[PDB]
């Protein structure tokens, strides 16, 4: 069947001199597998699934290095966006980024994502063609022109269509007994994956619940 | 795994 791997980043500015928050979370479908928190002593990408714990220190070392780079990038982004919108230093602001890939039943690239939101409103997004951008407003046109001239979509297409898919495939094989699992709603209770046809809620045991 | 590449908006 169809699977996906997604990365969700939130970064929240704090009034004045307070350093900002940064949350990195990773999912393979409806199962979270990794986390990185700014307000955590560890300062390391941490496993949130059993199957990812089998990975070597090199993996965890790299994932920590790459998230600290993303974190520093989004910290700069908060400062940039305040300027783009001509905002003050006392009011709290949020930057959200998501990226990832969907694979079909043959575990082959289906579709890719790469989008940002600022204060809960869409800011910029890579289109389904993975060549062009959707700039919500005049502030986001400064971003689109920078990313076009510097050929970002081509590099992002490379990761999404290839690397991203290869990782999704490695996780699916490693997490065999967890991710490839199909449940089985009761009449809708204790089913997996979450997609079904009140909002679908996590039972907290890996499965979900729904009401008619 | 995540991107090894970072860029500012």
């Amino acid at each position, epitope marked *: 069947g169809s699977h996906s791997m997604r990365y969700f980043f939130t970064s929240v500015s704090r009034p004045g001199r307070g350093e900002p928050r940064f949350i990195a979370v990773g999912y393979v479908d409806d199962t979270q597998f990794v986390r990185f928190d700014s307000d955590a002593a560890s300062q390391r990408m941490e496993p949130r699934a059993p199957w990812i714990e089998q990975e070597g220190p090199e993996y965890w070392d790299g994932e920590t*290095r790459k998230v*600290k*780079a993303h974190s*520093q990038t989004h910290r700069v982004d908060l400062g940039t966006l305040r300027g783009y919108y001509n905002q003050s230093e006392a009011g709290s602001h949020t930057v959200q980024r998501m990226y990832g890939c969907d694979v079909g039943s043959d575990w082959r690239f289906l579709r890719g994502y790469h989008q940002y939101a600022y204060d809960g409103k869409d800011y910029i997004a890579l289109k389904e063609d993975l060549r062009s951008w959707t700039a919500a407003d005049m502030a986001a046109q400064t971003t689109k022109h920078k990313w076009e001239a510097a050929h970002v979509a081509e*590099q992002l*297409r490379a990761y999404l269509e290839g690397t991203c898919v290869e990782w999704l495939r490695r996780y699916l094989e490693n997490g065999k007994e967890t991710l490839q699992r199909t449940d089985a709603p009761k009449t809708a209770l204790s089913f997996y994956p979450a997609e079904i046809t009140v909002e679908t809620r996590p039972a907290g045991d890996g499965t979900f619940q729904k009401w008619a | 795994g995540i991107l090894g*590449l*970072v860029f500012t908006l």
Partner: T-cell receptor
Framework: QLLEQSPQFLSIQEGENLTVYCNSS?????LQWYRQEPGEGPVLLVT?????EVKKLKRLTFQFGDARKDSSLHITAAQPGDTGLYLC??????????FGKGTKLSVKP | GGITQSPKYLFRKEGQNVTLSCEQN?????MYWYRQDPGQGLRLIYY???????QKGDIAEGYSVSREKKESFPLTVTSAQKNPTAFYLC???????????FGPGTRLTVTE
């Protein structure tokens, strides 16, 4: 990611037309060419992004291969002022450029 | 704008720690340090994709870097660097992985 440059050395004659190669097995999202004189900073000649794309700068013609795994550097009517190390580089997955070892070109009078 | 590396020539007795300057007013997010031996290619030492983050290149042993400001990317040649005499080159790019713009280079010669 790896970039292989051929030939390592080329010693041609002033007036001759030559071609230097830069190949990989992996696709590169963008590619660069440089020229470096000894003990001086490399000068960027071009950036190629589209496969099949041909660009021209001074007496140089660059061509990015269709699959984007290779590029060539053609010099028309070479002058002794084309002497130097030619370096190709490509977009690195880890936030850097992937460099080839180069072609040392000597244009003899 | 431009990329500068001063001075052109650096001279030090073995055992001394030395700082190689690299500055740019090009508004480039990423900076790089390479070394090149005579009749040889470029070798990546250290690099920074964004301010407050750095990462090791292929030859990072005995070197150290700082990225406190978008504009500077100082390289320290430490006593632990076995073969320190080389031509050192700094470069910057708008964003990492894009076309790099090289500084003029610094020739460092370390003496017995």
């Amino acid at each position: 990611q790896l970039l292989e440059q051929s030939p390592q050395f080329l010693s041609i004659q002033e007036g001759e037309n030559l071609t230097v190669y830069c190949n990989s097995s992996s696709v590169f999202s963008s590619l660069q060419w440089y020229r470096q004189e000894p003990g001086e900073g490399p000068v960027l000649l071009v950036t190629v992004v589209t496969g099949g794309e041909v660009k021209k700068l001074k007496r140089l013609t660059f061509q990015f291969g269709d699959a984007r795994k290779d590029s060539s550097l053609h010099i028309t009517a070479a002058q002794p002022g084309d002497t130097g190390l030619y370096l190709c580089a490509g977009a690195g997955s880890q936030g850097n450029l992937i460099f080839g070892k180069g072609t040392k070109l000597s244009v003899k009078p | 704008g431009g990329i500068t590396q001063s001075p052109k020539y650096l001279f030090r007795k073995e055992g001394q720690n030395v700082t190689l300057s690299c500055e740019q007013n090009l508004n480039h997010d990423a900076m790089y340090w390479y070394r090149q031996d005579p009749g040889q290619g470029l070798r990546l030492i250290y690099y920074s994709q964004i301010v407050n983050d750095f990462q090791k290149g292929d030859i990072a042993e005995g070197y150290s870097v700082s990225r406190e400001k978008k504009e500077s990317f100082p390289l320290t040649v430490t006593s632990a660097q076995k073969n320190p005499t080389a031509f050192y080159l700094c470069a910057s790019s708008s964003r990492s992985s894009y076309e790099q713009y090289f500084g003029p280079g610094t020739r460092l010669t370390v003496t017995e």
